[PDB]
Amino acid sequence: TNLPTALITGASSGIGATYAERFARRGHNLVMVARDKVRMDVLASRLREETKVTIDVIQADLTQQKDLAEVETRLREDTSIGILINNAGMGQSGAFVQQNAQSIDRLVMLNTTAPTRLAAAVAARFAQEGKGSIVNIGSVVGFAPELGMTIYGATKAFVLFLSQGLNLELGPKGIYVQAVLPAATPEVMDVNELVDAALIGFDRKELVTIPPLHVAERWNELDQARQGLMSEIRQAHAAERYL
Template sequence: MTSQTKGFALITGASAGIGAIYADRLARRGYDLILVARNQSRLDALADRLTKETGRAIETVATDLTDKTGLAKIEKLLREDARITMLVNNAGVGSVASILDGQVDSMESMIDLNITALTRLTYAVAPAFVARGAGTIVNISSVVGIAVEMLNGVYSASKSYVLSFGHALQRDLAGKGVRVQTVLPAATATEFWDVAGYAKQKEAPSTMTAEDLVDAALVGLDQGELVTIPTLHDGDGWTQWEADRRALAPGFANAKAAPRYASSVVTGR
């Protein structure tokens, strides 16, 4: 017999890797699940296992979030299904190719998934959570959203977007009962690297397991962190970096250019 539910957590990219571990951990924390990914057979296998192990109610939706019809289906679910209390925006794809090697159509598809789908799903669920005065949104960014030179430029930029979007969400939803956490994984041992074109990264000593990543991210959520970087041992480093970033803002409000941009050309008649 299952215990009382904490509501349904909808997880995108849930069939493998980080998404599948989120499914496992949230089910064990008392959430029922709606698992979203493209591969129905993988979703079914995960749902069957977790149902047997946890007794939670688990639903699956096989859809491609880069397809407008498939994306609209999940948006409608998030707007209308009052059982949903958590959204984990995990679906994403990456690349290690430079602008000289990458195909622009693949980059556009990356933007569709990493940015457009995440944004539309968040816009769908946020008003519903606010109306109920409760809800949790977890957006999966990446440390390359800060260390932008490490991987493909479009991928890094997409993850910088997720981080910036999270800051704005936290501002807009403050005091409305909605928690927003942005998680920044570093290298994590998942199929991400196979798709990105650098499978050997999974074997590197500095690569974290998906289990350790998700467990740490959930502790960060429990502790009320707005931004969680599981691999960063010097937490004060992030705190200071973020404080310095915010401290720059007042300095932007000037009608005149800084003296360093004054023209050195002397004009005469």
């Protein structure tokens, strides 16, 4: 059976690097995309020797239009790429009043605009072939505006909604769209634990995978509450409490 090549963003460290290591050991060829080329080459050299798979290393600053369009083109034309890992370690630096226009641009671009454009690059080809996987790395911060990471959490709420919408749109076409929601990473989770758990959901083709969530029912309750709100949407007139 064909094991498809996986393109992974932010593949130089953290979740991206661990995803590259796991897929290489599984037998997948890789396309590693990251701004930090030095760490990518170190990791790629080790994975080539250990796993004998093919690894192409692309240096790219996805806040650049030039670099992002080049990665988009690779996803569109490389028919061997059947897996896209939308990963970005880009977080928010402190409070909202400390953000400047430039850091907001980069934060939204890396966590929202770039993942959406990459999914659009493979969506048309995945629909042609009737197969493919899009794994979007969100965060549980998208559920918690109380944590004080306002812009970052907002981009993660974006990524979750994007995954839910892409599933309903691309699912019937044979495309698997997964949302992975790591914890804010006071002992936190090991990155090996996190990615191994995310892959257990990937193999089950789970749509929303939240490794740090103790009660899986909590998600379904939130989804039910969401759909329960939409059942009371009557667009003809405003509610009486506003009259």
